[PDB]
Amino acid sequence: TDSFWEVGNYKRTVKRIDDGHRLCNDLMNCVQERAKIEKAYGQQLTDWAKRWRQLIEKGPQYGSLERAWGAIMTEADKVSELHQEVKNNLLNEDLEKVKNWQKDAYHKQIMGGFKETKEAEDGFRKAQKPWAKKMKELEAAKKAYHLACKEEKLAMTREMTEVPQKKLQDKVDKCKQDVQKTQEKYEKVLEDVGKTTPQYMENMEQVFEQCQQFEEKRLVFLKEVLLDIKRHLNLAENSSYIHVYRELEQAIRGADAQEDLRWFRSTSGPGMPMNWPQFEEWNPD
Amino acid sequence: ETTDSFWEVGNYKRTVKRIDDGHRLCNDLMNCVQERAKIEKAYGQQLTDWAKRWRQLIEKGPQYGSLERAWGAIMTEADKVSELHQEVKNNLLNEDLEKVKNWQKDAYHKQIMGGFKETKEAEDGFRKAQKPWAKKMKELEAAKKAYHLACKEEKLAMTREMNSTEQQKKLQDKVDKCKQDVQKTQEKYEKVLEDVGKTTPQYMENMEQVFEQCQQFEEKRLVFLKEVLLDIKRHLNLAENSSYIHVYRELEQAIRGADAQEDLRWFRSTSGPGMPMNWPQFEEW
Ligand SMILES: [Ca+2]
């Protein structure tokens, strides 16, 4: 019933074309929204770090420990930088890649809807035109034949007593002649059909196969954008990402309790210089 | 100038204020951790909304076959990365914030007024150890004045004597007193100078000992803090987590699985020329 081969069902193939352009928008929007997220995460890391740096040194912490604590903001900065890069990449590489591909692939007609869709609809319409026509011709004939066959059954039931009369057998005559004429036309229409079906199928097939090629360029491309995105999202394939954590561990393992204690001593404790009491002659001078 | 030396009276107060500072620092660390946890949570949350959103528009859109799966797979990464930022959030709050919170609670005990019991204990250790030296320090300043002043006066009497060009005897006995006064007060000033010198070593020993108790208390806080900074570091470190890499390994595997020709073959039987057809035949009665 809903077979591609029944009149008009090619439309489902045509509509895939249109769809193809929406899916590009879809994917571009998607990538955009993802970038907005990577960026917000990034920007909030930046804020937090700035703030903590200011707080930390505007506060009482001193020494190597101050530095280790400080070291944590430095990962916040480095990790913020990484997300910004991701955002930048999606936007300047991915979005652009899809935008560029789409505008070269789908050409807008000033009427509206795409030149490519139109081209495909026309081609199918053309391929199916003669064929759709015989179809209408055949059914008419099949029906005429069936009608004739019915009338004859009737005349026959009619002969099977009682009231010159000769007009009745002259009806069963006219009806066997109708069956014949009618059967003949039905058969010839059937024949032209069988004669034009190999060509109908070659024509549909060429159009179909062009549309398949066109969706193939799209799908193969899509698969490629998808890997690109995955490559841009994956911090784990960026050698930098482990550096940020090694560098922090170091800054932290580098802190020394006993180094700081001893600084304090010389800076605010017993380690500081003293002018011990000495005698003073009275000169007022 | 050693006006600020810790060895001057009252100047131990910098070591005392350091105790109070540690509590405050503990608070700062907790505030810092929480705020970072909140950034982790938000990025996670934003990822799950995104994944929800696009999971749905993908389902309802015209994208089908193995490509819909590959595109869809990206929503799974958003979700799993999201789940990983939530573990970072929870480790920070439930292990790290909690660990500092506890330690603080067992180290600083608020008193009724209330300062911290640990501060008061040091204020008093210092008071106690500085008591004799503080005393001897005001015996000296006094002794010194009594001397300076008595010299100043001697010059004065001598001066009237010069300015004199009976009672002239009441003016040279007036130098005679002022000479005895310079003697007696210099003896005092000198005997005190000797005491402070002599008892300087025990002033220092006392002080150095209270200060050592302070150092040890700070040491405990410093060693705690480094253990903590390391804890924060492990919890933040997705760059060396198994599951992080794995989400991208799975993502790549899903994307690579997608196969254009297959999708196309599918489309062809399903909606194309490969679909089943009932071609016209001769039809009876
Ligand atoms: Ca879908």
UniProtKB/Swiss-Prot annotation, chain A:
- Tissues and organs where the protein is expressed, per its UniProt entry: Highly expressed in brain and, at much lower levels, in heart and pancreas.
The molecular function terms in GO held by this entry are: cytoskeletal protein binding; identical protein binding; phospholipid binding
Q: Tell me, what is an example of a GO biological process annotation in this record?
A: neuron projection morphogenesis
- Residues bearing Phosphoserine are 64
| Topology in membrane | Peripheral membrane protein
User: Which residues, by range, are in coiled-coil regions?
Assistant: 11-252
**Subcellular location per the Swiss-Prot or TrEMBL entry:** Cytoplasm; Cell projection; Synapse, Synaptosome; Cell projection, Ruffle membrane
Show where the F-BAR domain sits: 1-260
Say yes or no: keyword S-adenosyl-L-methionine present: no
Tell me yes or no: is NAD among this UniProt entry's keywords: no
Impact of altering residue 110 to E? Reduces membrane-binding. Abolishes membrane tubulation
Domain comment in the entry: The F-BAR domain forms a coiled coil and mediates membrane-binding and membrane tubulation. In the autoinhibited conformation, interaction with the SH3 domain inhibits membrane tubulation mediated by the F-BAR domain. DNM1 binding abolishes autoinhibition.
Q: Which family does it belong to?
A: Belongs to the PACSIN family.
Subunit organization: May form heterooligomers with other PACSINs. Interacts with MAPT. Interacts with TRPV4. Interacts (via SH3 domain) with SYNJ1 and WASL. Interacts with DNM2 and DNM3. Interacts with both COBL and DBNL. Identified in a complex composed of COBL, PACSIN1 and WASL. Interacts with EHD1 and EHD3. Homodimer. Interacts (via SH3 domain) with DNM1; the interaction is reduced by DNM1 phosphorylation.
Function field = Plays a role in the reorganization of the microtubule cytoskeleton via its interaction with MAPT; this decreases microtubule stability and inhibits MAPT-induced microtubule polymerization. Plays a role in cellular transport processes by recruiting DNM1, DNM2 and DNM3 to membranes. Plays a role in the reorganization of the actin cytoskeleton and in neuron morphogenesis via its interaction with COBL and WASL, and by recruiting COBL to the cell cortex. Plays a role in the regulation of neurite formation, neurite branching and the regulation of neurite length.
Q: What is this protein called?
A: Protein kinase C and casein kinase substrate in neurons protein 1
Originating species: Homo sapiens
The protein's gene is named: PACSIN1
